Amino acid sequence: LLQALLTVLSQVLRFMETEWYLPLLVLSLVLGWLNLLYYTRGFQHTGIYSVMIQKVILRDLLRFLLVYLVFLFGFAVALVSLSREARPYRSILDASLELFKFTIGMGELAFQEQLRFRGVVLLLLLAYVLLTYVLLLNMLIALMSETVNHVADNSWSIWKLQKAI
Amino acid sequence: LRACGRFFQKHQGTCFYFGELPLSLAACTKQWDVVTYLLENPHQPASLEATDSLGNTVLHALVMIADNSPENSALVIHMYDGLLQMGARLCPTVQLEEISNHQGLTPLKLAAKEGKIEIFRHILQREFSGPYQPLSRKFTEWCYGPVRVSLYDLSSVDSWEKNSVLEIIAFHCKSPNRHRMVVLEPLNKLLQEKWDRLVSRFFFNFACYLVYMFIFTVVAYHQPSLFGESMLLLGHILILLGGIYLLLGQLWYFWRRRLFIWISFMDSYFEILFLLQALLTVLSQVLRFMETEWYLPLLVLSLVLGWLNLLYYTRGFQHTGIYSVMIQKVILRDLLRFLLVYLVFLFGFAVALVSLSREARPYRSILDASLELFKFTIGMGELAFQEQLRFRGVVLLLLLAYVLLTYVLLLNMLIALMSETVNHVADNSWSIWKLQKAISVLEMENGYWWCRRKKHREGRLLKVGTRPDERWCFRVEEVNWAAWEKTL
Amino acid sequence: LRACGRFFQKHQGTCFYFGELPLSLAACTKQWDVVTYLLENPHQPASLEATDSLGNTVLHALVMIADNSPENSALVIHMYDGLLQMGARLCPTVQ
Ligand SMILES: CCCCCCCCCC(=O)OC[C@H](COP(=O)([O-])OCCN)OC(=O)CCCCCCCCC
Numbered sequence: 083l084l085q086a087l088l089t090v091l092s093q094v095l096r097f098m099e100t101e102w103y104l105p106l107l108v109l110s111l112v113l114g115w116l117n118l119l120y121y122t123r124g125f126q127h128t129g130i131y132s133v134m135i136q137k138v139i140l141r142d143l144l145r146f147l148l149v150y151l152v153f154l155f156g157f158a159v160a161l162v163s164l165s166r167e168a169r170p171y172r173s174i175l176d177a178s179l180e181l182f183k184f185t186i187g188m189g190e191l192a193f194q195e196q197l198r199f200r201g202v203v204l205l206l207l208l209a210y211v212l213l214t215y216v217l218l219l220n221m222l223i224a225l226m227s228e229t230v231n232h233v234a235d236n237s238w239s240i241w242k243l244q245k246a247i
Numbered sequence: 248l249r250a251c252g253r254f255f256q257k258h259q260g261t262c263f264y265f266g267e268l269p270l271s272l273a274a275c276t277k278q279w280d281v282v283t284y285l286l287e288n289p290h291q292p293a294s295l296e297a298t299d300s301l302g303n304t305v306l307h308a309l310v311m312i313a314d315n316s317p318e319n320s321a322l323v324i325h326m327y328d329g330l331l332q333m334g335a336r337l338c339p340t341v342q343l344e345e346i347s348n349h350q351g352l353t354p355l356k357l358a359a360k361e362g363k364i365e366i367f368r369h370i371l372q373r374e375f376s377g378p379y380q381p382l383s384r385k386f387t388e389w390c391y392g393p394v395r396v397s398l399y400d401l402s403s404v405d406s407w408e409k410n411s412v413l414e415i416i417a418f419h420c421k422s423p424n425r426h427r428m429v430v431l432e433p434l435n436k437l438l439q440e441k442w443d444r445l446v447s448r449f450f451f452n453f454a455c456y457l458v459y460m461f462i463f464t465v466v467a468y469h470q471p472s473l474f475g476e477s478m479l480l481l482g483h484i485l486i487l488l489g490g491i492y493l494l495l496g497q498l499w500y501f502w503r504r505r506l507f508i509w510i511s512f513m514d515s516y517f518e519i520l521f522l523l524q525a526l527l528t529v530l531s532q533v534l535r536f537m538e539t540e541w542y543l544p545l546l547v548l549s550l551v552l553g554w555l556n557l558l559y560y561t562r563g564f565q566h567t568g569i570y571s572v573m574i575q576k577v578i579l580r581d582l583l584r585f586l587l588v589y590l591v592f593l594f595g596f597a598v599a600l601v602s603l604s605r606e607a608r609p610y611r612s613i614l615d616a617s618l619e620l621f622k623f624t625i626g627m628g629e630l631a632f633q634e635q636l637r638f639r640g641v642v643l644l645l646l647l648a649y650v651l652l653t654y655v656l657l658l659n660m661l662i663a664l665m666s667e668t669v670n671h672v673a674d675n676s677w678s679i680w681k682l683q684k685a686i687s688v689l690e691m692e693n694g695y696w697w698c699r700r701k702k703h704r705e706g707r708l709l710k711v712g713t714r715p716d717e718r719w720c721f722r723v724e725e726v727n728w729a730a731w732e733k734t735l
Numbered sequence: 736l737r738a739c740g741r742f743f744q745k746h747q748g749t750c751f752y753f754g755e756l757p758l759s760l761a762a763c764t765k766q767w768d769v770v771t772y773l774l775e776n777p778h779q780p781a782s783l784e785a786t787d788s789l790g791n792t793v794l795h796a797l798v799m800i801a802d803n804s805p806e807n808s809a810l811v812i813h814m815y816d817g818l819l820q821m822g823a824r825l826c827p828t829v830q
């Protein structure tokens with residue numbers, strides 16, 4: 083439904099000649115490729131796997147996200163505030179994206195010589211990294227304790243229900 | 248006679264505590280024919296009222312011999328009920344469970360303090376009929392199909408009274424099973440009734456901390472280089488006053504909880520973190536009035552710590568609350584031990600890389616080399632055959648050795664955490680969250696440090712027999728189809 | 736008579752739904768000697784067709800008392816089959 087709405091809206095915005103048609107057309111395109119994963123239920127082999135891949139619900143990741151976004155934005159406002167003085171964390175979006183890069187293996191640590199309080203900026207980054215790795219490790223171990231419990235694999239039955247619907 | 252020497256005292260060494268008197272010995276050994284003889288003989292009767300060097304009666308001594316195994320529990324429970332029945336015949340004017348030891352504890356308060364959950368549940372939910380009905384704490388009011396309606400005696404339980412079972416479980420007990428005690432009847436429904444009348448105050452306290460942290464963030468983001476200037480001054484005095492208010496409220500918490508202070512923060516470290524945030528806030532405003540540059544690091548550390556402090560209020564909802572408990576799995580217990588091994592590898596290879604990189608043919612300092620070595624743990628470590636160095640091949644072999652040792656250590660640490668944490672034990676996170684709600688409520692029931700509110704009794708004053716036997720009793724309705732159908 | 740007040744309705748609170756009528760109570764409690772008496776007595780027989788305030792018969796009420804545990808299932812199943820066999824003798828024209 084959402085892909086079809088965004089598709090019709092993108093064509094309405096294209097007839098209005100507004101630039102924002104292209105973001106809607108491109109969001110409809112991504113969502114339309116993700117929609118082809120529906121038809122994986124037509125075969126037993128992919129179908130049942132599409133059910134096995136539901137293990138980690140948004141139930142826990144949306145809760146972890148609350149804790150993670152408080153760490154992210156709390157350290158982002160702090161790094162921007164402290165980096166104002168020279169002796170670059172220029173905005174909350176800039177510092178949030180630099181702090182998020184640590185979760186994808188891309189985070190820059192430097193003793194950043196051009197700043198005043200550079201040592202406190204480095205200690206804030208080291209504290210954010212250590213807290214985030216404690217949080218991610220706790221989140222992963224808490225998912226294993228909930229999901230890896232040797233209960234019978236009901237994925238064949240849940241796929242037979244997808245076929246029934 | 249009181250066997251009171253160091254062998255007969257309770258301690259971690261070689262001892263046998265049973266109380267100190269013959270009757271308490273005969274009860275703790277399960278000699279019911281010696282107990283009735285010592286009580287009923289004509290030559291010299293024992294008294295159930297008699298106390299040892301801690302002020303413990305035989306009923307306190309029975310709570311002291313309890314472990315939570317089912318056989319020891321059944322034997323302590325049979326002996327405890329037998330001695331109450333005996334007291335109802337030999338000293339019927341005396342309430343044996345109202346006798347306090349030298350710590351001010353009755354047998355029920357001692358069972359709560361010492362974490363004796365099986366005898367604690369038994370005393371709290373006890374019921375009898377015919378001659379012993381006045382010895383009950385639970386009274387069935389009516390039963391119809393799967394539904395039982397009961398009155399529970401709240402006399403030493405409700406937090407309206409000083410040093411109650413609720414205050415003891417929350418703040419004076421140090422047993423790991425505190426969270427199992429708060430989910431028993433009548434404590435479960437009683438704590439829910441207290442939560443439901445305080446949940447609006449909990450989210451008012453959260454909203455005031457959100458407004459304080461919003462003002463803190465707006466002010467920290469608009470600091471000048473070392474109308475809007477007047478609003479920035481207003482923001483600094485609101486941060487000063489909020490910092491003083493939180494500081495006074497937290498110092499008052501640690502003053503009220505001074506007798507048990509080393510446990511008052513053990514599952515409640517947010518009382519340390521709220522105190523520390525308030526201190527660093529007040530210090531940042533003092534340093535700002537002194538015009539020293541170091542005010543800004545303190546203001547910014549207070550800001551970070553204040554956003555981390557908002558994670559306290561996740562306990563207000565079942566969904567986030569219980570998850571905040573599930574996310575405690577990996578304690579600092581193992582990561583602080585792993586950190587010892589990791590910091591020896593880090594600094595041992597850092598001094599080595601700095602020493603060997605001195606010669607050309609850049610690891611310039613211990614901080615530089617420590618940060619380059621730490622970058623391997625976050626997926627950012629540079630490996631190069633570093634051509635400008637003398638011994639470049641040995642520098643590369645030191646880096647490859649550090650990487651392989653660190654990946655062996657991290658893999659060992661992760662596998663050792665899985666072996667400790669992923670063991671299919673029952674998910675007690677709901678109970679530990681009900682204990683967080685219990686601690687929060689028992690704090691909110693006092694009101695604020697400046698407001699000191701009056702408390703109200705819960706349950707109703709009701710006649711239960713002769714035992715007239717009038718008590719503050721709390722109505723609980725249990726529906727239990729699975730227990731009921733087994734009786735048919 | 737239909738015990739129909741809020742205690743006898745199905746909801747998340749404190750209640751005992753069994754249907755609302757004596758026969759549905761006697762079936763939901765497993766009193767098979769009260770069920771046959773209420774059905775077969777000469778003074779006033781119960782009807783298996785009788786419905787409560789939701790339109791539930793005693794067979795709907797038995798489905799409503801079911802949990803998926805093996806003992807509760809065996810007891811609901813025995814009572815349900817017994818009442819169909821009784822209907823085959825007391826109201827044989829009625830499905
Ligand atoms: C001298 C009397 C002053 C009366 C002020 C009345 C304020 C009412 C709001 C209130 O107490 O909110 C509590 C909140 C901290 O939450 P908590 O108590 O659960 O604590 C957390 C426990 N884990 O507190 C805050 O967030 C601070 C609010 C900002 C300061 C208010 C003005 C102060 C003037 C001196």
Ligand SMILES: CCCN(CCC)S(=O)(=O)c1ccc(C(=O)O)cc1
Binds near residue numbers: 388389390391742
């Ligand atoms: C207030 C309601 C009481 N009723 C139950 C309603 C379903 S009752 O039918 O009057 C009743 C039943 C059983 C007992 C008993 O066993 O003690 C007492 C009273």
